[PDB]
Amino acid sequence: YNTFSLKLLEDALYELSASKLAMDDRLFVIKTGERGAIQFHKEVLKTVSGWTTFVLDNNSTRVVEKVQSRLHSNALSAGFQFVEYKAPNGVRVRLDVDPFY
Amino acid sequence: YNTFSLKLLEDALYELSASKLAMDDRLFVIKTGERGAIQFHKEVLKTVSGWTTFVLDNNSTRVVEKVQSRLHSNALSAGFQFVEYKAPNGVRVRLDVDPFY
Amino acid sequence: WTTFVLDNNSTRVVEKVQSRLHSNALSAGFQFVEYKAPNGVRVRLDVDPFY
Amino acid sequence: MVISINQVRQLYVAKALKANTAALTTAGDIVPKADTAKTTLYFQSMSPAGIVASDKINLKHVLYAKATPSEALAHKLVRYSVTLDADVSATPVAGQNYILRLAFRQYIGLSEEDQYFKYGEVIARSGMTASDFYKKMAISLAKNLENKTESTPLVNIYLISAAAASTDVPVTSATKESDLTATDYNQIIIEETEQPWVLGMMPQAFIPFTPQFLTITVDGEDRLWGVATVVTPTKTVPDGHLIADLEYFCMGARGDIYRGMGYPNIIKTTYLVDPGAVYDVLDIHYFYTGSNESVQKSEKTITLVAVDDGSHTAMNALIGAINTASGLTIATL
Amino acid sequence: MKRVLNLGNLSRIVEGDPNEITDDEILVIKDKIIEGKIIDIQKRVDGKLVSLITEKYT
Amino acid sequence: MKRVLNLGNLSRIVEGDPNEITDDEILVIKDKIIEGKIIDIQKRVDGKLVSLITEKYT
């Protein structure tokens, strides 16, 4: 590939899984480098940003969190990362960032 | 059909149910392939999109959930599938994916 | 971050107080003193008066 | 190439034609022998190890005798012509990723369940042209299908310039958009490629494919950009590799079935078919029926293969011989 | 009298850069001449911004 | 780039009859002849239901 997408590997993973795997055994533990883990996060995000039928409350995602500080009594954090995806029919996706990459 | 409409199917199943079935005994299992399950998911999704009165929150649906990793502390997963539609007067619609399809 | 929706239930940027003027007394205010970036890169802040 | 037999099949290479049992000097020389009272037919062939004759054919118990040309056995390679749908959009979309999918049907294993998918991805850009998109798509497929690390050849991919309209521009994994200097590219051809071959171990097979597309948002709706179409083939795998396995098979009826089992302790069989040639084939189906109760038929086949010089001279001469000696009529091809 | 759209699609109605809005966001433009008017509402169609309001003619 | 209104004031963007639109809610008139386009955004001021889009001519 030259341009990477989640549509791309979601299709690849599923076609392989439909042809070759059963629904329960379609978990895929990808091995990659940090710079692909961020590419993954970006694309998973770009995909979720189109989920307008759902409102992602922070009480469940906790992208923003309450932290102790001396600067304020309600001191807040911010930050999240997408490390998985669940395509239909049991297709899962999990990462293992190995420095060898 | 050319384009699967759950609006068409919802009417057909209820009209048949009203004329022929009790309130119970209205579970309409559907045998289909894996791609039909995708079509079902899409159409159920597109209908709950017109429920502008209601608000789908991730605290109950859990389309985005928290997973433990080593790249981030607020590490997130994503994904969901629509498998069932419950229509007026006990007209359920369940899926039974058969590899034979 | 238009994707996510920030609710007071988890941030408590508008808190409830034991006042004398009302039974539902509110207090507002929040500060972002921290940021978590991908792959462990977490930036705490320290405020030193020397600066 | 194990095949099905109607209780037997036998093959004789007609390298030459001699007109007398005396003139059988070298291997591959063959003569049709039938008495004046045309009741029997057989062939005296010269083997690597001496003269030899074929089973006698009762001209009354012959079922069908037909000659098949070389082109009849030449597998035309299936080639598609994939373009983008002028209905969705006659041009690429500004910021869409077009992911073309080639699902391969009979991969390593025999079954249709042995599937294999290869992709070509192209993210379009504002100002991008159709020709430029075909360029990039073909190049992506090259890197994925015409690479050197692939275990087995899968497909050939080409490009066509509207100016040419028939010439196909090869696009290999070494090619680059600097080498593809044109602006009137109409389509992307994806052709079927010949798989490997081994005598008696790997029969002449192919792996077929259909091009599938993924869906792009064109205004606000997921739609497919491409239309895959089958156009007339222009390449053909020649007959040489089929006849060779046919001989490697049909000579175990006239001889050693332990082709190589027992490695030091074996009996090697010299063959007369060069897989780098093109043979025309001739098959005769016939049977033997017994006497007063043994009426059950024993259908049998005797096949003769001769090289084609382009006009079917060897076989047509062989046909004239068998027809003038047997009274048959085998419809010279 | 239902909401024209759900909140997950209304949440993405934003105000600011025309370059930074994704395909998932609706862009509003507060008129600068008048104090409480709107001048255009836009969302990305094919990477380009187009007005949702139908154009009027005489 | 940021959101244009608190979701409380965006949840009151409705699709219905001009005669039932009070204040604390904005009205959208979808277009029929065209599928996705909109006709007008409306907001009541003094009993009258006025538009927020500025008229644009040639």
UniProtKB/Swiss-Prot annotation, chains A, B:
Organism domain of life: Viruses
Compartments, record wording: Virion
Residue ranges crossing the lipid bilayer per the database entry: none
Role according to the record: Capsid protein self-assembles to form an icosahedral capsid, with a T=9 symmetry, about 77 nm in diameter. Each asymmetric capsid nonamer is covered by 9 capsid auxiliary protein, 1 copy of the trimeric head fiber protein and 2 copies of the dimeric head fiber protein.
Subunit structure: Interacts with the auxiliary capsid protein (via FD region). Interacts with the head fiber dimeric protein. Interacts with the head fiber trimeric protein. Interacts with the portal vertex auxiliary protein.
Note in the entry: Displays an HK-97-like fold with an insertion domain that protrudes at the capsid surface.
Listed name of the protein: Major capsid protein
Species, as recorded: Bacteroides phage crAss001 (Bacteroides phage PhiCrAss001)
UniProtKB/Swiss-Prot annotation, chain D:
Gene Ontology terms: cellular component: viral capsid, decoration
Keyword Protein biosynthesis: no
Alphabetic keyword roster: Capsid decoration protein, Capsid protein, Virion
Intracellular or extracellular location(s): Virion
Region (FD): 75-237
Domain characteristics, as noted in the entry: The central region FD is structurally similar to Helicobacter pylori flagellar cap protein FliD.
Summary of subunit composition and partner proteins: Interacts (via FD region) with the major capsid protein.
Purpose of the protein: Auxiliary capsid protein that forms an outer layer on the major capsid protein protrusions.
Protein name: Auxiliary capsid protein
From Swiss-Prot, chains E, F:
Function: Forms short fibers at the surface of the viral capsid.
Full protein segment contained here: 1 to 58 of 122
Keyword Cell division: no
Major subcellular site: virion
One Gene Ontology cellular component: virion component
Protein name per the record: Head fiber dimeric protein
Signal peptide (residue range): none
Complex formation: Homodimer. Interacts with the major capsid protein.
GO BP annotations listed: symbiont entry into host cell; virion attachment to host cell
Keyword S-adenosyl-L-methionine: no
Subcellular location per the Swiss-Prot or TrEMBL entry: Virion
Keywords of the record: Host-virus interaction, Viral attachment to host cell, Virion, Virus entry into host cell
